[PDB]
Design an enzyme around this catalytic site. Structure first.
Site, short mmCIF file in Angstrom:
data_model
loop_
_atom_site.label_atom_id
_atom_site.label_comp_id
_atom_site.label_asym_id
_atom_site.label_seq_id
_atom_site.Cartn_x
_atom_site.Cartn_y
_atom_site.Cartn_z
CG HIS A 1 -0.17 -0.18 2.65
ND1 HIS A 1 -0.56 -0.77 3.34
CD2 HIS A 1 -0.66 1.25 3.32
CE1 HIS A 1 0.08 -0.67 4.19
NE2 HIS A 1 -0.05 1.24 4.66
N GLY B 1 3.19 6.63 9.89
CA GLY B 1 4.35 6.06 9.42
C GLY B 1 5.03 5.19 10.06
CB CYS C 1 2.42 1.04 7.72
SG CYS C 1 0.68 0.84 8.31
C1 LIG Z 1 -0.28 2.49 7.77
O1 LIG Z 1 0.03 2.33 6.36
C2 LIG Z 1 1.03 3.50 8.32
O2 LIG Z 1 1.56 3.75 8.93
N1 LIG Z 1 1.56 4.30 6.32
C3 LIG Z 1 2.73 5.62 6.40
C4 LIG Z 1 2.02 6.90 7.06
C5 LIG Z 1 0.44 6.64 6.94
C6 LIG Z 1 0.06 7.74 7.61
C7 LIG Z 1 0.76 9.08 7.74
C8 LIG Z 1 1.49 9.33 7.72
C9 LIG Z 1 2.63 7.86 6.85
C10 LIG Z 1 -1.30 2.74 8.66
C11 LIG Z 1 -0.31 2.15 9.84
C12 LIG Z 1 -1.52 2.71 11.35
C13 LIG Z 1 -2.18 4.81 11.76
C14 LIG Z 1 -2.04 4.69 12.90
N2 LIG Z 1 -1.96 3.70 13.23
C15 LIG Z 1 -1.67 2.86 12.96
O3 LIG Z 1 -1.31 1.51 13.04
N3 LIG Z 1 -2.27 1.91 8.09
C16 LIG Z 1 -3.28 2.52 8.07
O4 LIG Z 1 -3.13 3.72 7.83
C17 LIG Z 1 -4.63 1.90 7.07
C18 LIG Z 1 -3.26 1.36 5.05
C19 LIG Z 1 -4.53 0.41 5.33
C20 LIG Z 1 -3.86 -1.25 5.51
C21 LIG Z 1 -3.56 -0.81 4.16
N4 LIG Z 1 -5.29 2.11 7.83
C22 LIG Z 1 -6.11 2.65 6.61
C23 LIG Z 1 -7.19 3.04 6.85
C24 LIG Z 1 -8.15 2.54 7.82
C25 LIG Z 1 -7.37 1.95 8.84
N5 LIG Z 1 -7.37 1.81 10.22
C26 LIG Z 1 -8.40 3.01 10.88
O5 LIG Z 1 -9.23 4.22 10.23
O6 LIG Z 1 -8.86 1.73 11.48
C27 LIG Z 1 -9.59 3.40 12.96
C28 LIG Z 1 -10.15 2.32 14.35
C29 LIG Z 1 -11.13 2.72 12.52
C30 LIG Z 1 -9.21 4.38 13.20
C31 LIG Z 1 -6.02 2.03 9.06
O7 LIG Z 1 -5.14 0.89 9.29
#
Ligand SMILES: *[C@](O)(C(=O)NCc1ccccc1)[C@H](C[C@@H]1CCNC1=O)NC(=O)[C@H](CC1CC1)n1cccc(NC(=O)OC(C)(C)C)c1=O
Ligand SMILES: *[C@](O)(C(=O)NCc1ccccc1)[C@H](C[C@@H]1CCNC1=O)NC(=O)[C@H](CC1CC1)n1cccc(NC(=O)OC(C)(C)C)c1=O
Lengths: 303, 302
Positions: free
Chosen positions: A41, A143, A145
């Site tokens: 992703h 961040g 991930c």
């Molecule tokens: C991960 O992708 C990540 O760190 N991406 C890089 C990045 C993101 C944001 C800003 C700068 C860089 C994140 C890790 C998450 C964020 C908060 N804590 C974590 O463990 N994962 C996602 O954002 C993930 C991506 C999807 C799998 C492909 N994602 C997307 C959309 C929704 C959610 N979850 C969500 O909304 O959960 C609740 C509890 C409803 C907030 C999600 O994890």
């Protein structure tokens, strides 16, 4: 003496962590030899995330769209490949601090160390159990991930987890290092929920053993139970059934303390039914289920 | 999302761990530049001990009596001195893996990471607090002596603890890296008593702010308190005094949550007076006092 939640020393993994940027998205990759592994992703904008066609998104990306940084050194990408939910970026330079490693899939109820990273820089280390519902109770921000979970056995790192997502209730989901999710989760922005969790009976008994070895022993009693009569009370309280294989796996701790598993089970039945009455076990006022029998043995014998 | 007892990544400290042997006794040493630091009791046996005269026993040792192993390389000891309760062993080689570092003496309530080592080989990392009675609640077996506590600030490793001894009921004591004990303890084989411990109040408030940041809010009431009226109740439940300095240090967490420190104190006052009544906070059934305000901000921010 003393008993603490303990992670593996993380140095061998720290030397592998790198930052992967694709356009607008930056997260963490794992650099082993001339391959960097990260969540696929990384190629998405939030636009793409509702239902991402990863095969078609990847066709439109060049080697040049991937910025990989190890410390303050740019690694050149010379090849990209997708496997399930993980992206493999081939680079010109092999990681000279690549430790001896395997990719394994951990079973529910087994533990591992998480190295939380941001911008490919380790921030912290802590211990997690793979829950029965295929979630982990972690600490992850934007961040995080591409942060990984691992066990070390001698010189060999067994990599079992890469971080992908957060779920309602503040729990976390990810993939093994072959890119298969633990549990029924998908890498896209859809509403997802963890199933009902259960308590890992075998791990609670291990921790009771840990308590006794450390001289915290007030909950011991002269009483014993059958396996069936114990499992009658376990099922009521949403604890996994205790199998003969669990009783056998507890054999070393049982022998070390001289307390039979079915004697210990009579302690646990009383604790479930009557609570702790204001007392603690190893500094906790509830029953801890995130130590495996092996985690207790490793810590109490010091390898 | 989520809040965990978290340790610093240990890599920068792993590369500094060595095995120090003086005849029969082996324990861990810390190799920085061309100095190995280890507990001075590496020079004793059972023969000595109960109450050894360390200055006397060190006179009758020589450089060659110290076997220093860095993995499976022998280091050559070319000089030795005692500073309080640690040995400084001069070696012919500088550690290529020496990180930027300082030695600091930490204060009660401050937290640090412990890399537990056996025979110069790291076994595990966990987080600890310096208790108000200057003990730590560690996990240390035979061979653990010389294991160190540390904080990492950016690139810079702050060494604050070296492990020396066990005390009653599974608690631990050691020195700073200048070899001065934390607490009224001595490196003698003799019975020593810790002194009564208390709860680190500033750390409970920090962790109640962590609870609110992470969606645990049930314990917030609509009351405020004076510092004095709070301490009247705190002292009754064996809690450290909360100082105006502690209130000022909880400022950033206050601002990030929009809950004034004295409003959070009124919530804690109610929790001490009535209990949690079987409900949990951040997955705990008691009040956690081993997160500093700094630890809460670090974990919630980056
Ligand atoms: C991960 O992708 C990540 O760190 N991406 C890089 C990045 C993101 C944001 C800003 C700068 C860089 C994140 C890790 C998450 C964020 C908060 N804590 C974590 O463990 N994962 C996602 O954002 C993930 C991506 C999807 C799998 C492909 N994602 C997307 C959309 C929704 C959610 N979850 C969500 O909304 O959960 C609740 C509890 C409803 C907030 C999600 O994890
Ligand atoms: C430390 O010396 C060490 O790890 N190396 C010695 C060693 C012993 C056995 C085999 C190989 C190497 C230990 C660390 C201790 C052991 C148990 N848990 C620990 O954290 N330190 C001591 O044994 C220490 C040395 C004293 C300071 C100079 N020591 C000696 C004798 C008694 C105690 N404490 C003790 O008995 O505590 C009570 C509360 C009475 C049980 C002690 O710490």
């Amino acid at each position: 003496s003393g008993f603490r939640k303990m992670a593996f020393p993380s140095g061998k993994v720290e030397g592998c962590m790198v930052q992967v940027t694709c356009g607008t998205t930056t997260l963490n990759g794992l650099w082993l030899d001339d391959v960097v592994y990260c969540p696929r992703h990384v190629i998405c904008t939030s636009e793409d995330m509702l239902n991402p066609n990863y095969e078609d998104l990847l066709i439109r990306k060049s080697n040049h769209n991937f910025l990989v940084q190890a410390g303050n050194v740019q690694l050149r990408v010379i090849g990209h490949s997708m496997q399930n939910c993980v992206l493999k970026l081939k680079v010109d330079t092999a990681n000279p601090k690549t430790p001896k490693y395997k990719f394994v899939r951990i079973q529910p109820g087994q533990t591992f160390s998480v190295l939380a990273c941001y911008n490919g820089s380790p921030s912290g280390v802590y211990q997690c159990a793979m829950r029965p519902n295929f979630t982990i109770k972690g600490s992850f921000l934007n961040g995080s991930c591409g942060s990984v979970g691992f066990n070390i056995d001698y010189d060999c790192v067994s990599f079992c987890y890469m971080h992908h997502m957060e779920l309602p209730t503040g729990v976390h989901a990810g993939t093994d290092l072959e890119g298969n999710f633990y549990g029924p989760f998908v890498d896209r922005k859809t509403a997802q929920a963890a199933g009902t969790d259960t308590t890992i009976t075998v791990n609670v008994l291990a921790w009771l053993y840990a308590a006794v070895i450390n001289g915290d022993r007030w909950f011991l009693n002269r009483f014993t139970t059958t396996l069936n009569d114990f499992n009658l009370v376990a099922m009521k309280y949403n604890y996994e059934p205790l199998t003969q294989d669990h009783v056998d796996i507890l054999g070393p701790l049982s022998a070390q303390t001289g307390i039979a598993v079915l004697d210990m089970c009579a302690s646990l039945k009383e604790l479930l039914q009557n609570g702790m009455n204001g007392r603690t076990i190893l500094g906790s006022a509830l029953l801890e289920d995130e130590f495996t029998p092996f985690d207790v043995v490793r810590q109490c014998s010091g390898v």
